[PDB]
Write an enzyme that holds these catalytic residues in place. Structure first.
Site, short mmCIF file in Angstrom:
data_model
loop_
_atom_site.label_atom_id
_atom_site.label_comp_id
_atom_site.label_asym_id
_atom_site.label_seq_id
_atom_site.Cartn_x
_atom_site.Cartn_y
_atom_site.Cartn_z
N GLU A 357 11.78 21.89 -40.70
CA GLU A 357 13.06 21.19 -40.66
C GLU A 357 12.93 19.74 -41.10
OE1 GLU A 357 15.89 22.76 -40.15
OE2 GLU A 357 15.19 24.65 -39.30
N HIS A 487 23.65 38.16 -42.32
CA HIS A 487 24.03 37.56 -43.60
C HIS A 487 25.08 38.38 -44.34
CE1 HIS A 487 19.99 36.07 -42.55
NE2 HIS A 487 20.41 34.94 -43.09
#
Ligand SMILES: *[C@@H]1O[C@H](CO)[C@@H](O)[C@H](O)[C@H]1NC(C)=O
Ligand SMILES: *[C@@H]1O[C@H](CO)[C@@H](O)[C@H](O)[C@H]1NC(C)=O
Ligand SMILES: *[C@@H]1O[C@H](CO)[C@@H](O)[C@H](O)[C@H]1NC(C)=O
Ligand SMILES: *[C@@H]1O[C@H](CO)[C@@H](O)[C@H](O)[C@H]1NC(C)=O
Ligand SMILES: *[C@@H]1O[C@H](CO)[C@@H](O)[C@H](O)[C@H]1NC(C)=O
Ligand SMILES: *[C@@H]1O[C@H](CO)[C@@H](O)[C@H](O)[C@H]1NC(C)=O
Ligand SMILES: *[C@@H]1O[C@H](CO)[C@@H](O)[C@H](O)[C@H]1NC(C)=O
EC number: 3.4.17.23
Lengths: 596, 201
Positions: A357, A487
């Site tokens: 991240e 998704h």
């Protein structure tokens, strides 16, 4: 005066007002994520509606500037991005129906709760109730029950909804001068107007097949080894000649194979590289985790985190009283505001996630100099790939020894490298045929190659042919087995993971050649190398201003996605798997030989 | 001799509110004693870039008048307050001459000029037909005509309002946080110079 200057002034006005509206919306989303309360939900919805209405009004204003009278490539790129209708080209009744369908699929996936018939007094949600069962159970009929019951409830709810979804999205896409919705998704990789560096929407499918044909021997050997180990774990269910049963892959859908590392470990007797206990012994706080990640990024030459990052990020779970989303997310709020929302534990996975991240944050910081509508990755693959390369580099034993988390007298022999590479293959190589098969199936559904009455007969046929995974029991057309995944049920492109996986190892070879690493690729660490960071930052600073082919030329020296760095990364494991598969049979049969 | 009547630097630097960069305040400072070492030795200023003169001899030299221009800009726009620069602030808001003698003093004011809802009380000119002349102030609020069509006073298509608000917030990056800028312009004219430095005893 001229049309181009008019468009430039309009883009200046858009950039300036969109950056502030995007900030307000992103701050509302942040305040919802760090504080789940109903007024924060209402404020988020109000800001999102203002942002979407502003984008509608600016696209409506933007279309009045014709594209062919503008010669500057960046201005034309921003105008191309802005002038897309999206769903606005569709009629208001059908747009409202499509939005309602998307929202109700989101609610069905998020609030889907399934439990055993004749025991209905309490039930388990997908996260974490079903995830833990799928990832940790060793019982055949329990996993079969969970898998079939969740695809029964979710698919039988979502099948008419998906049948409406495909028709509405194809109508919207053909109203936008695309062939289908698959062409709309493939238009992210379309490069037009640059001499030599042009990339077509139709070239993407050919390149994906061409790379997957080179993926296929490594995946066949890995599949044979995993089949033999699962045959040892489950004695009678798995056939030597057939495909793997679907509910035994360690995850709900077969997305990753990383939960089979315990069952399929090569050398269990040898130790692991787990550094969790070492951080617990030295009392490593999450602040120390992020500071070590920042030390990694300053060692390669990238900029260090802002003061506002340390002040405004939530790097620890707040408590019982305050609710927050546990999923790790890097936020580019706009205007130089960069934050990480992660519920960081003292584990290796959270440490690698912190590196991942913060790599996302570095990518976001690098293109802050770009105009607002060009502040993205060159494609959808690069943004995830630049975090995954940090996850690759931080996981190496050299990085752990360098930062003191691993003992300096830890013996790095070939067996630990083989089992580490097998874990990385179960995470990385195993997702590639599933990703390719899912995107090819969705492309054939949108293209109309597969009629609605033949969706599942083809789908399992594709899964046997490509993934080498067989259905436990046959499914009819009342099921909607793809849309049980996050998704596909929530309208997300899925080829970004395939492209991310190939770009990951291409970037890794480029930076390791820059860093003059002289050993195996998986033993390579990009810390202490200023030139590797400079070669990375040359692409990182571009953002969406340049074509992704030119950015890939800037990093690796190639104009196209390449599969050879991935095969080079797993080459010791590939030779070891070829040695271990002498007695066994590589490859599978698409017939129903194990179970149906 | 014994010196009194100091120059009013408290009403420029320690002002409770600063002007917008499109309507930058100009204060003419005359007939007093200007102690510049108080400003230079302060730790509260991030930029003290002097062009055409050095800060050490400011406390010695004497000038006819001192022009103190005060405004608020972004962090990334402080570099444009310099001779020969190009940008939105230099072209459309505040232009410095190439032959400029004086000092540009800037400091971060995220504590005062940023609120949690967003401080939209600071404006900057985004569009003008031509670049500004040095030390020019444009406070016109007439609609910018980017196209051939007449605006007719209404903000429609190709016609934009030239003044756009800053949206200062305290959670912003250092390149977007508000910076209070005071520019001192020193000129010597044939009139008797009365703004002199303090004389040591
Ligand atoms: C979270 O929301 C509650 C509910 O109003 C509020 O009292 C609290 O101050 C908030 N905390 C943060 C950190 O935003
Ligand atoms: C395109 O426009 C940008 C400003 O938006 C300018 O800096 C750049 O030089 C232009 N490029 C060309 C090739 O004219
Ligand atoms: C967007 O829709 C409008 C109205 O249907 C149409 O005139 C325009 O050409 C469309 N723009 C694009 C890029 O398709
Ligand atoms: C980032 O690095 C610079 C110089 O290397 C340093 O002055 C600054 O304090 C660092 N940032 C933080 C938040 O410590
Ligand atoms: C590791 O190296 C030793 C020494 O050559 C060899 O005997 C052994 O078979 C190797 N093991 C693997 C898994 O490559
Ligand atoms: C990278 O640089 C730091 C700074 O001195 C050093 O402590 C560290 O050992 C270096 N890494 C390696 C692998 O030598
Ligand atoms: C302005 O305020 C600062 C901080 O309170 C103070 O130190 C200074 O003496 C004041 N006056 C001037 C002229 O800077």
């Amino acid at each position: 005066s001229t049309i181009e200057e008019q468009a430039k002034t309009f883009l200046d006005k858009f950039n300036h007002e969109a950056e502030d509206l995007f900030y307000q919306s992103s701050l509302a989303s942040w305040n919802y994520n760090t504080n789940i309360t109903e007024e924060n939900v209402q404020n988020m919805n109000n800001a999102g509606d203002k942002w979407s209405a502003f984008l509608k009004e600016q696209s409506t204003l933007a279309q009045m500037y014709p594209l062919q009278e503008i010669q500057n490539l960046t201005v034309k790129l921003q105008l191309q991005a802005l002038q897309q209708n999206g769903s606005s080209v569709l009629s208001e009744d059908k747009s409202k129906r499509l939005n309602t369908i998307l929202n109700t699929m989101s609610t069905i996936y998020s609030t889907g709760k399934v439990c055993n018939p004749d025991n209905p007094q309490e039930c388990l949600l997908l996260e974490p109730g079903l995830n833990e069962i799928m990832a940790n159970s060793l019982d055949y009929n329990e996993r079969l029950w969970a898998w079939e019951s969740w695809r029964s409830e979710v698919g039988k709810q979502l099948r008419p909804l998906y049948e409406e979804y495909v028709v509405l999205k194809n109508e919207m896409a053909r109203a936008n001068h695309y062939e289908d919705y698959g062409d709309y998704w493939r238009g992210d990789y379309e490069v037009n107007g640059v001499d030599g560096y042009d990339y077509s929407r139709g070239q993407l499918i050919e390149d994906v097949e061409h790379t997957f044909e080179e993926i296929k021997p490594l995946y066949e050997h890995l599949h044979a080894y995993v089949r033999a180990k699962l045959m040892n774990a489950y004695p009678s269910y798995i056939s030597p000649i057939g495909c793997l049963p679907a509910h035994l892959l360690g995850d709900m859908w077969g997305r990753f194979w990383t939960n089979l590392y315990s069952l399929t470990v090569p050398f269990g007797q040898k130790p692991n590289i787990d550094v969790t206990d070492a951080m617990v012994d030295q009392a490593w706080d999450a602040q120390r985790i992020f500071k070590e990640a920042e030390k990694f990024f300053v060692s390669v030459g990238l900029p260090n985190m802002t003061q506002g990052f340390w002040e405004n990020s939530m790097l620890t779970d707040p408590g019982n009283v305050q609710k927050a989303v546990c999923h790790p997310t890097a936020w580019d709020l706009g205007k130089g505001d960069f934050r990480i929302l992660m519920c960081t534990k003292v584990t290796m996975d959270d440490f690698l996630t912190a590196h991942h991240e913060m790599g996302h944050i570095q990518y976001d910081m690098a293109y802050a100099a770009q105009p607002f509508l060009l502040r993205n990755g060159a494609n959808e693959g690069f943004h995830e790939a630049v975090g995954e390369i940090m996850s690759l580099s931080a996981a190496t034993p050299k990085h752990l020894k360098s930062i003191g988390l691993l003992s300096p007298d830890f013996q790095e022999d070939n067996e630990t490298e083989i089992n580490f590479l097998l874990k990385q293959a179960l995470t990385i190589v195993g997702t590639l045929p599933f990703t390719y098969m899912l995107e090819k199936w969705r492309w054939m559904v949108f293209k109309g190659e597969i009629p609605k009455d033949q969706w599942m007969k083809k789908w399992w046929e594709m899964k046997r042919e490509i993934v080498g995974v067989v259905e436990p029991v046959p499914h009819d057309e009342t099921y909607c087995d793809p849309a049980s995944l996050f998704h596909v049920s929530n309208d997300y492109s899925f080829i970004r993971y395939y492209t991310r996986t190939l770009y990951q190892f291409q970037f890794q070879e480029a930076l390791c050649q820059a860093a003059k690493h002289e050993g195996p690729l998986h033993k390579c660490d990009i810390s202490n190398s200023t030139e590797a960071g400079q070669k990375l930052f040359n692409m990182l600073r571009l953002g969406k201003s340049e074509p992704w082919t030119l950015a890939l030329e800037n990093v690796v020296g190639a104009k196209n996605m390449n599969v050879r760095p991935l095969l080079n990364y797993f080459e010791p494991l590939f030779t070891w798997l070829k040695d271990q598969n002498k007695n066994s049979f590589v490859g599978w049969s698409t017939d129903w030989s194990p179970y149906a | 001799p014994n010196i009194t009547n100091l120059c009013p630097f408290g009403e420029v630097f320690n002002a409770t509110r600063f002007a917008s960069v499109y309507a930058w305040n100009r204060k003419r400072i005359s007939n007093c004693v200007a102690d510049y070492s108080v400003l230079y030795n302060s730790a509260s200023f991030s930029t003290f870039k002097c062009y055409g003169v050095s800060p050490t001899k400011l406390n010695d030299l004497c000038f006819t008048n001192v022009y103190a221009d005060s405004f608020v800009i972004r962090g990334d726009e402080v570099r444009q307050i310099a001779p020969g620069q190009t940008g939105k602030i230099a072209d459309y808001n505040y232009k410095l001459p190439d032959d400029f003698t004086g000092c540009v003093i800037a400091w971060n004011s995220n504590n005062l000029d940023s609120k949690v809802g967003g401080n939209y009380n600071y404006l900057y000119r985004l569009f003008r037909k031509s670049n500004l002349k040095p030390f020019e102030r444009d406070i016109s609020t007439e609609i910018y005509q980017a196209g051939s069509t007449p605006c007719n006073g209404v903000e429609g298509f190709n016609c934009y309002f030239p003044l756009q608000s800053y949206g200062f917030q305290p959670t912003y990056g250092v390149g977007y946080q508000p910076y209070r800028v005071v520019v001192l312009s020193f000129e010597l004219l044939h009139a008797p110079a009365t703004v002199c430095g303090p004389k040591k005893s």
